[PDB]
């Protein structure tokens, strides 16, 4: 009543995230450690150097 919607309780979660994070506790530990999960684009994905360009707005290339 005080909440117009019936309150909902989260009873579990799952996650697979960069930097080897596959559990919420792993995410919490990484967050407390102040770790970063951003890295260079892996080559097997594609050639980052091929498409990289520091110049803004260059067609066909990313920044």
């Amino acid at each position: 009543m005080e909440s117009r919607v019936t309150p909902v309780a989260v009873i579990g979660m799952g996650c697979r995230l960069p930097g080897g994070i596959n559990s919420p506790d792993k995410l919490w530990e990484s967050l407390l450690r102040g770790d970063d999960l951003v890295t260079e684009i892996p080559p097997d994905r594609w050639d980052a150097d091929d498409y990289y360009d520091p110049e803004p707005g260059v067609p066909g290339r990313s920044v």
Binding site: E55, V58, P59, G60
Partner: protein, 63 residues
């Protein structure tokens, strides 16, 4: 270096509209011609004061 400098250098890069073409050449023809255009600076701005010069080829090329 000076008004009688025998060496010059220039910052050269393909235009954004063409920068993507670099993946299909050993040297992009436009970039190489731009490098040739750098010779137009010469020892002086008055180098070959009259008429237009055109390249006739080079002794050797080392990629």
């Amino acid at each position: 270096a000076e008004a009688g400098a025998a060496t010059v250098l220039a910052e050269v890069a393909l235009p954004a509209s063409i920068r993507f073409q670099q993946g299909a050449y050993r040297i992009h023809p436009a970039l190489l011609d731009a490098c040739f255009q750098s010779v137009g600076a010469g020892v002086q701005a008055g180098t070959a004061t009259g008429g237009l010069l055109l390249p006739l080829g080079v002794r050797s090329l080392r990629a």
